Amino acid sequence: GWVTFYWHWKHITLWQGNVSQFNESSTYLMGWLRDYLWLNSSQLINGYTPLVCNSLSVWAWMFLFGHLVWATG
Amino acid sequence: GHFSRTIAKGPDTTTWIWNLHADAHDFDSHTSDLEEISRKVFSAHFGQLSIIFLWLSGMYFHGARFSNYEAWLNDPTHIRPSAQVVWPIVGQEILNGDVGGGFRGIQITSGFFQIWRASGITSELQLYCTAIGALVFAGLMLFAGWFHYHKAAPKLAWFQDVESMLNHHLAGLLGLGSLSWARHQVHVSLPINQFLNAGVDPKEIPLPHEFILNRDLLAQLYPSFAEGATPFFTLNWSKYADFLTFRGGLDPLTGGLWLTDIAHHHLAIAILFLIAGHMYRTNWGIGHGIKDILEAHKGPFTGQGHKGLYEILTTSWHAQLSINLAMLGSLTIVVAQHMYSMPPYPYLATDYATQLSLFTHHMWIGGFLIVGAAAHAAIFMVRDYDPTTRYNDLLDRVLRHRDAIISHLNWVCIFLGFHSFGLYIHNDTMSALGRPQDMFSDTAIQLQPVFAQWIQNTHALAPGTTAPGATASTSLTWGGGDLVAVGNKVALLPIPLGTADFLVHHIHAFTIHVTVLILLKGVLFARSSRLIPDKANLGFRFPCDGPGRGGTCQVSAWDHVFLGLFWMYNSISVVIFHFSWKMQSDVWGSINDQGVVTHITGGNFAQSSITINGWLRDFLWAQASQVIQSYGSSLSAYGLFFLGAHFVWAFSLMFLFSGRGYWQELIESIVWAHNKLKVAPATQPRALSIVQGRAVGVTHYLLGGIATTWAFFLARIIAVG
Amino acid sequence: RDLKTYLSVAPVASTLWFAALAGLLIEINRLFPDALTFPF
Amino acid sequence: GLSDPEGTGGFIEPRWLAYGEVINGRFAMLGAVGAIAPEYLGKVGGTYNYWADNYTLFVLEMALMGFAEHRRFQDWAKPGSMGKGNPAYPGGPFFNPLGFGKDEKSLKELKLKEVKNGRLAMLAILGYFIQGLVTGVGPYQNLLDHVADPV
Amino acid sequence: DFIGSSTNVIMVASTTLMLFAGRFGLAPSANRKATAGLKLEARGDPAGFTLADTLACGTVGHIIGV
Amino acid sequence: VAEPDRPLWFPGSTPPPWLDGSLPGDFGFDPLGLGSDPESLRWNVQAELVHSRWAMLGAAGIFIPEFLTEYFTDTTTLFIVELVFIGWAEGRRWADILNPQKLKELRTKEIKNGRLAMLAVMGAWFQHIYTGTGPIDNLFAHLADP
Ligand code: CLA
Numbered sequence A: 001g002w003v004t005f006y007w008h009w010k011h012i013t014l015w016q017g018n019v020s021q022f023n024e025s026s027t028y029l030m031g032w033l034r035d036y037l038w039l040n041s042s043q044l045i046n047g048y049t050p051l052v053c054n055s056l057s058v059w060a061w062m063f064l065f066g067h068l069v070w071a072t073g
Numbered sequence B: 001g002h003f004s005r006t007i008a009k010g011p012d013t014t015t016w017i018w019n020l021h022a023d024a025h026d027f028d029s030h031t032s033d034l035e036e037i038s039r040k041v042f043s044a045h046f047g048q049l050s051i052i053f054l055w056l057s058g059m060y061f062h063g064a065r066f067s068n069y070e071a072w073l074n075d076p077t078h079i080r081p082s083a084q085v086v087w088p089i090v091g092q093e094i095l096n097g098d099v100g101g102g103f104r105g106i107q108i109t110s111g112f113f114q115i116w117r118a119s120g121i122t123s124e125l126q127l128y129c130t131a132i133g134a135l136v137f138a139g140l141m142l143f144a145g146w147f148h149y150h151k152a153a154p155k156l157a158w159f160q161d162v163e164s165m166l167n168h169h170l171a172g173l174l175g176l177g178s179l180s181w182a183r184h185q186v187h188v189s190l191p192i193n194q195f196l197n198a199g200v201d202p203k204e205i206p207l208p209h210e211f212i213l214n215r216d217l218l219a220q221l222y223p224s225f226a227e228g229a230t231p232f233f234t235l236n237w238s239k240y241a242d243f244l245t246f247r248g249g250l251d252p253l254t255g256g257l258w259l260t261d262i263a264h265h266h267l268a269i270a271i272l273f274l275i276a277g278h279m280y281r282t283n284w285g286i287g288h289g290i291k292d293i294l295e296a297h298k299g300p301f302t303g304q305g306h307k308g309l310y311e312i313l314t315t316s317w318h319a320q321l322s323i324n325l326a327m328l329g330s331l332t333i334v335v336a337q338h339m340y341s342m343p344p345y346p347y348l349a350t351d352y353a354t355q356l357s358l359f360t361h362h363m364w365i366g367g368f369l370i371v372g373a374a375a376h377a378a379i380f381m382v383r384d385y386d387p388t389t390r391y392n393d394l395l396d397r398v399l400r401h402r403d404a405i406i407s408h409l410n411w412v413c414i415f416l417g418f419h420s421f422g423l424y425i426h427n428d429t430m431s432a433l434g435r436p437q438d439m440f441s442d443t444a445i446q447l448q449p450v451f452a453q454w455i456q457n458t459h460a461l462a463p464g465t466t467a468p469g470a471t472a473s474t475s476l477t478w479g480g481g482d483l484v485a486v487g488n489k490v491a492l493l494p495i496p497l498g499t500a501d502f503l504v505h506h507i508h509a510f511t512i513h514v515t516v517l518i519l520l521k522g523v524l525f526a527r528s529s530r531l532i533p534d535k536a537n538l539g540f541r542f543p544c545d546g547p548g549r550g551g552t553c554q555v556s557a558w559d560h561v562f563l564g565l566f567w568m569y570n571s572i573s574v575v576i577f578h579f580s581w582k583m584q585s586d587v588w589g590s591i592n593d594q595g596v597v598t599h600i601t602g603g604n605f606a607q608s609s610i611t612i613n614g615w616l617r618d619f620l621w622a623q624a625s626q627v628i629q630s631y632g633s634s635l636s637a638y639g640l641f642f643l644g645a646h647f648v649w650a651f652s653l654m655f656l657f658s659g660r661g662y663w664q665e666l667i668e669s670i671v672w673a674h675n676k677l678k679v680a681p682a683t684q685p686r687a688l689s690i691v692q693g694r695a696v697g698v699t700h701y702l703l704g705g706i707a708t709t710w711a712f713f714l715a716r717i718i719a720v721g
Numbered sequence C: 001r002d003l004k005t006y007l008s009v010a011p012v013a014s015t016l017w018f019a020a021l022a023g024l025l026i027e028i029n030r031l032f033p034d035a036l037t038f039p040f
Numbered sequence D: 001g002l003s004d005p006e007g008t009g010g011f012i013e014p015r016w017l018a019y020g021e022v023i024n025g026r027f028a029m030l031g032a033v034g035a036i037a038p039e040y041l042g043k044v045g046g047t048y049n050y051w052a053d054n055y056t057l058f059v060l061e062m063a064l065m066g067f068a069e070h071r072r073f074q075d076w077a078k079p080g081s082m083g084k085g086n087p088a089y090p091g092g093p094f095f096n097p098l099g100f101g102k103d104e105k106s107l108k109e110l111k112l113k114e115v116k117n118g119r120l121a122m123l124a125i126l127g128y129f130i131q132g133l134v135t136g137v138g139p140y141q142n143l144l145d146h147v148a149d150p151v
Numbered sequence E: 001d002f003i004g005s006s007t008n009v010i011m012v013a014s015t016t017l018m019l020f021a022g023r024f025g026l027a028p029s030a031n032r033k034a035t036a037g038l039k040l041e042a043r044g045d046p047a048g049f050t051l052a053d054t055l056a057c058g059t060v061g062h063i064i065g066v
Numbered sequence F: 001v002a003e004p005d006r007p008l009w010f011p012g013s014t015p016p017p018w019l020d021g022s023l024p025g026d027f028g029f030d031p032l033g034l035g036s037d038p039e040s041l042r043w044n045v046q047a048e049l050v051h052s053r054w055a056m057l058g059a060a061g062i063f064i065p066e067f068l069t070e071y072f073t074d075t076t077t078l079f080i081v082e083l084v085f086i087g088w089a090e091g092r093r094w095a096d097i098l099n100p101q102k103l104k105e106l107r108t109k110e111i112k113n114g115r116l117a118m119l120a121v122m123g124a125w126f127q128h129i130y131t132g133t134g135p136i137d138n139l140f141a142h143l144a145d146p
């Protein structure tokens, strides 16, 4: 989990042409939860909205699905 | 173990240390002497009262020397209530923030500021005295316990006279207590606050004692006080109606209940508790034998009933403790839901930060105490239940059809769980597939809570019709077309109930029923079960009875409290969430010059709280932004505690998902490394007991979980409200 | 009077020790705050 | 049953506390007439101030009184005291010899009339209290005004 | 004040008097309504000169309200 | 050397088993017991002594202001030499602590006076603190009026 978090975040900051955000936010744990977890969830959790429905609706549903199986364990 | 000699004996393992604290207050395991126990707990209550008294002293003291209460008094609308100051060490001073009144401190949510204004307190001088008076009392209470255990300890016969104790407590404490406070109101609270609402300024207010001595100052307003003889002895009582009324509703300038009503309230409550105090039998004839009356109730269904109860509730503390904990907790819950709907303090409703934290605090305290009732009820079954000497018969039957009660309650939870959570999974699926018409919503197939909507409707049309003396409504959530707005903030407003409100109530029905199931199952099957016919001999707090019978883990009544403890968390945790979103979305907000009201989240509750994704996004993800962006500001601590709680929480899963057998074997390797270097302790290190690991687990789970929202909420409402 | 001493010699000892340790550390930080290095 | 004791006792139940009752039979007595003495010696011909602040006298009102009322207990607690000419051979309830000159005289009881003078002077001086308090005027004003307009 | 005063102060002292009548009972010595009213009713009755001025001010307060 | 006769501080009674009047100045005082161990007392004794001896001298500092109704290198050296000197002094006194019927009188009396200075030396300052005024004159200067 830590390995894949580290790989993904450093790359999505690179792909956006903004490695500066990673270099400063990765040094403290609030940065991880906010600039990585919170920040990239917006488009995901709006896969299906009380207004519309996107192509990311599958992933928004599976995202909640994964939470449900996890908590059931 | 200090309490017991064999227990004290000697330490050979570290388990001794953990046991020492675990059974520190277990008074009935140190002696079989009821009198000795009763003497112990009675003194313990004194020691308690001392601590809370000291607690109060510090609240008044800090309000005097370390607060901007005076500054807040002149400008309550946009001054932030702050007590306690932080010393400028290792970068701490950032927690001291702009709270107004030219003062640097941490914004508070206890609500003492609102309490103090209601009491008519005006100066730090007055707060300073009350702090000392509390300390003086704290010295008394502590001393009183020492005196009643080493000098003059009461007989068992003293404690057993429950009749005499009842009469006093609901009259001597309740009645006169309500009456005494009723006097302070109309003599001090009402006069002084009347000035405060006129913008007179605290220092320009005369001192409270000047209102009492000469009627002149108190009589110009509320002219019923003018008559020295008073119309009380004339028994007309109609004249008094100026200082006290049945107006109800809410003062549009202070946003709290009319003190004009609370005084009348206590006046009634007082004598109502004074009359009800004259019920039970004592010495001078007149009264009731509760033993007698209890015996009288019997039934075709109950056969003998209540016979023998008086014997049980006069020889078993755990029996009394369970009952008291069950309702004191239940009382704390209804307190939470009465103070939000009927704001009793000046500038309380306006202070959103205080209201959220008050409601949320009372919900947990109430929730915990109720769970504690389950424990001691189960402890009673294991330790004090003896049919030979104290048969009840009511208890019987219950034990007789116990497999019935649990089986039915088992079913209801499944019915409720499906018909609550399932609806959400329905909506989450219909919206994802692109069909909102299908969902359970106000816009689609709607499930209107017409029953709750009907009760509210009759409460609106109550004043004048079925309540002539009532000029206005009870609470403005039952108002209809009324709207109170103190400052630029909305104090209260009629709260609507839709399909989104139908679902969440059914979730509370659920969570409460399951919590009841787990706890009630542990109490009835505490002694015997088809699986374990002699569980009572294993005690109340035991880990198990081996892997036999397929596995008998957590068969103890202790473990049923353990499992029901998480569920009480799961329960409240969603009540407070319901409160937070609903109030922010459909109540709290700013009112303009035209009268247009904009709420904090803008009425997104009705169509977005019907989805799970909706709570995870529009509620959690949205309203978190405050806590996770609080670094470099005054709310820095909340951001850290938010992260700090997430840790003690995930730290609990370490204890909950594993067993001590692994750990003890790990210690073996570590003890070896010590023995190699002459650093092996004579007190051999042992892993936690099977039961302790569960106790350690749930505490950290509740702490990390509860604490984590605490930081959630307190960061949210402060930055927004 | 032997009794008071022992009393102060249990886990309380730990609190007194850690209070004394904390006081030392904080005071050190007062005289030398924001220390990211040992430069002497 | 307020009267019946049965105690060890922390003193609400046993014999003393009616002991004190016996002795406040005396300074509610000396206190009363000693308080009317300035009231009606001026009959012939509220902070209020005298000398310094009377809290200073207090320190010397609870000083000597200390050095005094202290010992008195000592006897009680245990017959002798022994520090000074001082003799106190009398019984703890009463010690007439040595501080009463030449008399010695107790049995009629008088003591029953001295406790009778006692708790009527209690209510006499308990008069003085609630009297001049809740009204706003002294004990002799309303009293004179009470035989003035009874009904 | 005057006579009028003494007439209300006597009926707020006779608001008392009417719950004397509940229970007054009588039947002394025959029939039994006294002994019956001294059996369970009353364990004395100036405890009900005292139960009088308590609930009586309430009965007037409620008889105006009822 | 035991007697029930010693002028107790509080008359009738005052007898702690540890105190007995064997020591000089034994007025039977110690509710707390602040020394019920002989190691406890033997130390307290020396402690209560040296103090007194010092307090006396301190008193001899109240003797000088009535004769008349502070260094060549203030503190610093003056202290180190003091530390270095009274050190060695007190040094040996320490090593000694751990390694005629007439004289009793002298020593009983010595303590009591000594007890006086401490209460004295104390008094002059908690009257001087918060209350900027010397005690020099106060004996008959404050005796003018309370
Ligand atoms: C005045 C000083 C004093 C002294 C010398 C004693 C001495 C004693 N007591 Mg008494 N006691 C006192 C005051 C005192 N007590 C007061 C004021 C109360 C009223 C609360 C009691 C109530 C009491 C009871 C019910 C009992 C004793 C017992 C005893 C005996 C055993 C000590 C013990 O219980 O174990 C442990 C010693 C402790 C100090 C335990 C700590 C408890 C304190 C109160 C904790 C303070 C609360 C703390 C601030 C909570 C916040 C913690 C936070 C930092 C996390 C011992 C002779 C026991 C006995 O007689 O043996 C059979 C016993 O049953 N005491």
Ligand code: CLA
Residues within 6 Å of the ligand: A068, A071, A072, A073, B409, B410, B411, B413, B414, B415, B416, B417, B418, B421, B422, B425, B514, B517, B518, B563, B564, B566, B567
């Ligand atoms: C999120 C995980 C999770 C879930 C779903 C549950 C669910 C449940 N718990 Mg549990 N619990 C959990 C975590 C969870 N718990 C944890 C972490 C603890 C530790 C404290 C506990 C401790 C606990 C105790 C002590 C008890 C329960 C009980 C129950 C049951 C209550 C009855 C009920 O509502 O039935 C309804 C079922 C649901 C609401 C689950 C979802 C149903 C789905 C949406 C519908 C079916 C889907 C579909 C038809 C499946 C077909 C697809 C096909 C391909 C297979 C319910 C099964 C109680 C019980 O036994 O019943 C009374 C009980 O005593 N729990």
Ligand code: CLA
Residues within 6 Å of the ligand: B021, B022, B023, B024, B025, B026, B027, B321, B325, B368, B369, B370, B371, B372, B373, B375, B379, B540, B541, B558, B561, B699, B703
């Ligand atoms: C009315 C109040 C009340 C009273 C007087 C008692 C009294 C008692 N309980 Mg009970 N209990 C209560 C409420 C109450 N309880 C409630 C509401 C619950 C539900 C949670 C329980 C659950 C419970 C269990 C499971 C047990 C008891 C037991 C007992 C008995 C002895 C246990 C003991 O000494 O404590 C020991 C104290 C400790 C071990 C301290 C533990 C550390 C605490 C929990 C941490 C708290 C965290 C803190 C608040 C915040 C963090 C601070 C930290 C970071 C510094 C004693 C008769 C035991 C018993 O066997 O009965 C005879 C028993 O096993 N209780």
Ligand code: CLA
Residues within 6 Å of the ligand: B647, B650, B651, B652, B653, B654, B655, B657, B658, B666
């Ligand atoms: C966030 C939760 C969490 C945390 C912090 C840990 C931490 C640890 N685990 Mg664990 N584990 C967890 C969850 C967690 N686990 C879960 C969910 C499971 C599945 C059931 C496991 C299964 C597991 C196994 C099988 C093992 C561990 C082991 C360890 C230890 C590894 C040693 C180490 O790296 O650093 C050392 C310690 C830390 C990094 C954390 C210590 C906490 C702080 C830093 C201590 C400071 C205290 C501070 C002063 C606060 C004082 C509080 C105050 C009230 C006094 C470490 C203590 C292994 C072990 O025991 O190795 C020796 C090991 O065998 N874990």
Ligand code: CLA
Residues within 6 Å of the ligand: D030, D031, D033, D034, D035, D037, D038, D039, D041, D042, D045
């Ligand atoms: C039982 C013991 C006792 C005794 C013997 C006294 C005695 C006295 N008290 Mg005290 N008192 C007592 C207990 C006692 N008190 C207690 C317990 C209290 C607390 C409640 C008090 C509180 C108290 C107060 C507040 C005062 C007294 C005062 C007095 C004095 C009265 C002077 C006066 O103003 O009134 C009347 C006037 C006279 C008696 C003067 C008589 C003058 C005669 C008629 C001749 C006039 C001629 C003229 C002097 C010219 C000189 C010619 C010359 C040759 C005669 C008197 C000496 C007063 C005082 O202290 O005096 C300054 C006073 O103010 N007492």
Ligand SMILES: CCCCCCCCCCCCCCCC(=O)OC[C@H](COP(=O)(O)OC[C@@H](O)CO)OC(=O)CCCCCCCCCCCCCCC
Residues within 6 Å of the ligand: B297, B298, B299, B300, B301, B302, B303, B305, B306
């Ligand atoms: C559709 C809307 C209309 C509403 C009707 C249906 C909703 C109410 C549910 C009906 C329950 C019947 C109650 C009968 C009233 C009642 O309880 O009777 C009580 C009855 C009386 O016994 P006795 O006359 O002996 O009682 C006196 C002596 O026994 C005691 O001294 O005792 C029993 O029934 C014993 C068996 C327990 C019965 C268990 C059923 C429990 C139902 C559980 C549901 C609780 C719901 C609470 C919601 C707030």
